[PDB]
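HOLO CASE FILE
Compound: 2-acetamido-2-deoxy-beta-D-glucopyranose
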Amino acid sequence: RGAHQPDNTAFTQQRLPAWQPLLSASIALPLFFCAGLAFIGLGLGLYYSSNGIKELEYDYTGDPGTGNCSVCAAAGQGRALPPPCSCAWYFSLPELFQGPVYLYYELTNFYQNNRRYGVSRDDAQLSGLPSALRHPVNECAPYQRSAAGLPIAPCGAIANSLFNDSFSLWHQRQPGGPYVEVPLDRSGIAWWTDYHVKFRNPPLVNGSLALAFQGTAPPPNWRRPVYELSPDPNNTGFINQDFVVWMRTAALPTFRKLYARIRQGNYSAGLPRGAYRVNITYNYPVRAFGGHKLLIFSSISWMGGKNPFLGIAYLVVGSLCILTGFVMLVVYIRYQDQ
Amino acid sequence: DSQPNDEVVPYSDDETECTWQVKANDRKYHEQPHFMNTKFLCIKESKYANNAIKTYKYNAFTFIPMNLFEQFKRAANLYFLALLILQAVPQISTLAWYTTLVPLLVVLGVTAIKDLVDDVARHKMDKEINNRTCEVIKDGRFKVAKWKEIQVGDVIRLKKNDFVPADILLLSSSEPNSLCYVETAELDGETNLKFKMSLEITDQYLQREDTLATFDGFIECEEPNNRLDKFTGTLFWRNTSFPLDADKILLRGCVIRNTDFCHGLVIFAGADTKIMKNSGKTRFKRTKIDYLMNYMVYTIFVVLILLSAGLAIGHAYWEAQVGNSSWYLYDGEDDTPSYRGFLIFWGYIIVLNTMVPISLYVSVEVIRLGQSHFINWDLQMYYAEKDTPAKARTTTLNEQLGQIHYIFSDKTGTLTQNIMTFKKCCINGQIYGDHRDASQHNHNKIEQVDFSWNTYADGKLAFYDHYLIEQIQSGKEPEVRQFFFLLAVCHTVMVDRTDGQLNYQAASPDEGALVNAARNFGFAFLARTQNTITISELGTERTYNVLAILDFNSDRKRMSIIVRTPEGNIKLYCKGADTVIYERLHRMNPTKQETQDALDIFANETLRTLCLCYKEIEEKEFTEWNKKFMAASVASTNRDEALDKVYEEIEKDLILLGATAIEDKLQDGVPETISKLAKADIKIWVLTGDKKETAENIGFACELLTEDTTICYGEDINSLLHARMENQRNRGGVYAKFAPPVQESFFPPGGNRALIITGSWLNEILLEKKTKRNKILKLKFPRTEEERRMRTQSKRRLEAKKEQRQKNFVDLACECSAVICCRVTPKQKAMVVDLVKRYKKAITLAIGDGANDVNMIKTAHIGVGISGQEGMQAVMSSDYSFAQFRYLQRLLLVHGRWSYIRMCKFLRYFFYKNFAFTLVHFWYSFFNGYSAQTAYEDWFITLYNVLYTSLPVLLMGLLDQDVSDKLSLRFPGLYIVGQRDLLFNYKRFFVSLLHGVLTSMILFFIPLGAYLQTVGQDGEAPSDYQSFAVTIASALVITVNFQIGLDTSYWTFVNAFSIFGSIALYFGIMFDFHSAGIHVLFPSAFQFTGTASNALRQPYIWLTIILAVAVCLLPVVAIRFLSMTIWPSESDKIQKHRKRLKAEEQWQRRQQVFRRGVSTRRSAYAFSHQRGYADLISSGRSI
Ligand SMILES: *[C@@H]1O[C@H](CO)[C@@H](O[C@@H]2O[C@H](CO)[C@@H](O[C@H]3O[C@H](CO[C@H]4O[C@H](CO[C@H]5O[C@H](CO)[C@@H](O)[C@H](O)[C@@H]5O)[C@@H](O)[C@H](O)[C@@H]4O)[C@@H](O)[C@H](O[C@H]4O[C@H](CO)[C@@H](O)[C@H](O)[C@@H]4O)[C@@H]3O)[C@H](O)[C@H]2NC(C)=O)[C@H](O)[C@H]1NC(C)=O
Ligand SMILES: *[C@@H]1O[C@H](CO)[C@@H](O[C@@H]2O[C@H](CO)[C@@H](O[C@H]3O[C@H](CO)[C@@H](O)[C@H](O[C@]4(O)O[C@H](CO)[C@@H](O)[C@H](O)[C@@H]4O)[C@@H]3O)[C@H](O)[C@H]2NC(C)=O)[C@H](O)[C@H]1NC(C)=O
Ligand SMILES: *[C@@H]1O[C@H](CO)[C@@H](O[C@@H]2O[C@H](CO)[C@@H](O)[C@H](O)[C@H]2NC(C)=O)[C@H](O)[C@H]1NC(C)=O
Ligand SMILES: *[C@@H]1O[C@H](CO)[C@@H](O)[C@H](O)[C@H]1NC(C)=O
Ligand SMILES: [Mg+2]
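Model generated. Tokens follow.
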């Protein structure tokens, strides 16, 4: 009926069924009380779990007057080529470290999240495409070619500036007995996807990694070709554990990176009480811009590290929540048909 | 001392024999080169315009320039264009090839398509008026032709009830002496018929087709002038050319009536007609929210510039303190630190530019298009009888509907439906026809009594007094058989019986009703030849003879006749206004107080009354006055005044008969609509071109002005305004030394003071009259005006004398309950609208039909046209067009306020989702050396405001509603919160921005605190950029979508589906980009590989997102709850108490049977008729 009457459906007349929520007072109060209680409990759990973790640091930088490694504080010429001034430092443990132990190194004032620095890498070549190896991208601009004009194998400033220190740990069994070295499981120290999907060294021509890197000069600051980073075929090249760990950039200018973990056969527990020594190999220069270098022994829990921030934040939020709950209850009660 | 006439409609004093030369035949004569003008190129058109009509704006090939010029009136487009130019400079590009141009083109083309669809719609609406098939003389006979091909100089022929296509000169018709009857209800709002007399010479010559196919006459009329009533000119037909005047002219919007056909010469056409000169200056309309968005964009631009400058300074300082000392941030460049800061300035501009993103005018357009299409799908705005669906025509002025301050409305055709319908009468004391008013059938039903005893009843009147007809049948009283006979003798109606059944050709609406009532109460009216009129009194025919017809006049206000019966006896019958009769009645009438006290009841109802009397002239005294006005009839310069003197000589001893009543028929729903709109704090002014008396019964009928309301005509207003202005400035007799104009001492605070103003007094008050030529000296030159800085003619300063009367009058009309302007030129209506919108800055709506409201409809903020009738001149220039006045209830109290609310919600949420997103890089800048590093993934910044958060806001801006419309018309007061800009003004925008900055702060600084130290579980990738970016991004797409759930108050299914679809889309596309699947065959495109499925697998990261969400979302709930039980808003109160409330059904009449302070003494007299219909006394224009 009618040549121009509209269709009269539900949508076209603004009549779609719809639930209309009014913010009542029987929903606000239970929310601000239950949520507050849950936040209090959860934050208390986090706070106590973040405090049962023991850490130990040294700051083996040689900058000040005091310190074993300060004897080999360098100057502005470049003295890595002479002896690496291998220093050492001693400590004692009166108790155990029940649980597997992790060893990190920490740098400060190191801006690994600078925009120009962070994008100076060639992800395509680093993936392992057999064609992209010879031609890097223009982004690794001051680390793209060489003095002889040859292409570089990594093509980046992140790969050029790689941490080149080393550490070893020794323990004494009997009083006066000589120190002995304990193992460091230096394997599986990265994400499983990083050294199985991200990074793959190119296929073997004539069956050798070395024979597939011709022309590719090493980065200017290194001292070894990329295919020589370790005498182990399963850990060499773009999938070297140290190299892949270093390339996962950090978020803040004070970061740490995983170096090793102590869980091997001789004692699959914490470090027994006694006397320990660590040999270092001072090779990375950081004093030029005012950096720092630290070693860190630690353990873990379900949450992770030893940050007390988030638990305290939860406690504060829960306290504020319950206080606002009482304030709202009082305001509601005093106001009824007024 | 010529005072205002208040009867004239001063078409003069509005502007700012001269060779027009039509010579109507041989078209090629007007194609001569000298007549037609010249333009820059070969494109020179003519002087005589074509008869086509154009309303559309975009022609074939100016749609590109003209649309893009109005497109950049928005500041955001200049913003985007500046960014486009910036991002193309090679020294700072930070991007790939030009993929930042295409989105701008898509955004800029969507609006072009949307603004082209409307143009197409009106371009096809414009087609109807151009295909109406008049008849023209092509070479031989008459042939059917379109309107658009009528050119100036064409002989045309028109039939009855057909519109007049162009300004024509009438030259012949099919009536005696070749005259025509026209009506002009679309030109000046009148409702009675006018008569145009053709020239005498052409009457006796053409008369026929073959002679009409021969013509040589010239016309020397003036140029198009917009006067509508003068038309000087001559006609060189042949052999001593004949002059012309306005009595021989038909205009465009007029329609022929009661003449079979007529012929004419076309004189004007198209945009040269006298009705196309009154509609002028169509403009580009922008709503009130656009002027707010422009300021938003400017302040955001300033903020962006300042922030980028600050960060650039910070980077410059950082670079040569720690940057140029690090061997790992080495570059082959040698840029000095200042140049580094200068380059980081542009990098931060580009990074932080995503405030005001490109999807701002793509969502506004969608929202407004959706609401516009909601308007014309409304089944409750559809008129069943005339079948019109109430469409919307602009789709861009849509949130303006909820901010209206004033309404201006025409009277004829907008508030009334042009029906007269005689209601009741008062014969000798008691009134007749309440509903039963009898003893027989007084306790029966209230059905209509039949008239099945005449051959003339024809069933067209509804009467209910069984007593009146019962007595009439009984013949028990001869005091009524005389009264109802007067109605059938005192008029100028002409009868043209087609075939047996007789129909009445009445020139005035107010006379047809009386003759119809007389005919269907018996007492029919048969032939009226020239001197004798025949009356069928109760089936018995009689023939009297008319001696004189003392005609109607405007300042006389009465009409009478003198007849003689076959029984040799003369009588005089008169009818007219009470206030002029009561100085004429014989001083013996017993029933004067009875009828007078019954004349109030009628006037207490909203209806118009007349008074009737007769006089016994005997058969002797007559002769003296008969030859007296024989001597005074045929004269030279006193036919209209000496005859008036001899008229006022037998208006003594005029014993009464009783009074009548007639009732206008406004429409179904006007007074309820007016009451509803008055509750919502809107003011209604009625601007009409109709008579002053007629626009008072409408004022009382629609209850704009009622009892206990002073009227205060303009006579009083001029005196009051003069007294307040001339005195008490620094003068007024005794000086005051203060003379404070601050107190509104115009009227004491008593309210209910109406204001009825005529056009002439409107001119007088506003200090605007034309000056005659004998008042100024000469032109501008150093002879009349000397060297002393042009002291006389260049020193006008009439704006000092003006600009005070205007402001004073506008402030006077601010405190009146209702203002009615009558007899106004089409230009003066727009003048009043512009005055009200210049001072006391307000949003105005103008509604009305017909061609005399086009100017006012164009000039107001919103123009609504009434459609469904035949003439559609006010519908093609409007913005919205329904078919009844009452639908104004839903266009404002339902659609308008919902649209305003939804747009304000959208604008409040949009500028919150955008700072929470962009303002994180700013806080991050303090921790990475001010290096313009971003805190999100690369693929998240180009998909955030496209996929993740774009649909929920559209669904909320379309489907949301505060309260249902079933009770949004019950509470019109809810309109007020939109009328005063209380939902989104400038002060609220800076609160939405504060919410945004706090959200960004709490979204960045919690994850940073959690990420300060290690976060690894068993793979131990300690705090790293990838996981940090994923954590920050995934905790924003949740809070920004839970917030939109705290805004929607109408949760349809699609709303919840949209919200959770947004969240799930983000998560499920992130787990696809960060995957081993597409790392192959796309190596260097997706930076974050394998991090999503490796960071989101540990509890510590999830305990960080939950806390951020709970902190940046929970105090909002607290604030809402704490601001709702202390200051519950009006809609909150309505929604809270909706469970139990009573129904409502009201508006009976506001009955006021009598007052204890009787003071009115104001008569409801009104008669719509003209002067000069005494042609019968000259000759019988019957057959
Ligand atoms: C652990 O990692 C650290 C990384 O910090 C390593 O230390 C770095 O080892 C680099 C060697 O691989 C060494 O790089 C060069 O050092 C010397 C360069 O200094 C020369 O130039 C200085 C001026 O600097 C400007 O010179 C160039 C050219 O003139 C300009 O274009 C440019 O703007 C430079 O700013 C002078 O002031 C110096 O006196 C000196 O003249 C050199 O020994 C080497 O330069 C090479 O030169 C030619 C070029 O073709 C080669 O053919 C030649 O064989 C030389 O190798 C050298 O490349 C870094 O200085 C050094 N310290 C840093 C980066 O702080 C450790 O070695 C590493 N230890 C390990 C692996 O055990
Ligand atoms: C810290 O700040 C200092 C000074 O502000 C920076 O030292 C500057 O390094 C620039 C990088 O090369 C130097 O620019 C010029 O270096 C040599 C000088 O002769 C010049 O040949 C360069 O031209 C080329 O870039 O040279 C190569 C060489 O093959 C060409 O291939 C190439 O086409 C250009 O022709 C370049 O013009 C600049 O001279 C130097 N400052 C001074 C005072 O010498 C450090 O780099 C900054 N950063 C640190 C120390 O880490
Ligand atoms: C490094 O520091 C350790 C202790 O922090 C030094 O160890 C002591 O060395 C002296 C002589 O070198 C011995 O007599 C002590 O018995 C050592 N302490 C022990 C075994 O607990 C060590 O000498 C430092 N290395 C230097 C200075 O090169
Ligand atoms: C370890 O340190 C001790 C202390 O001198 C000594 O055996 C030697 O310097 C280091 N040995 C190795 C293998 O580095
Ligand atoms: Mg009208």
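CASE NOTES: The radius of gyration of chain B is 39 Å. The first helix of chain B runs from residue 63 to 71.
CLOSED: yes
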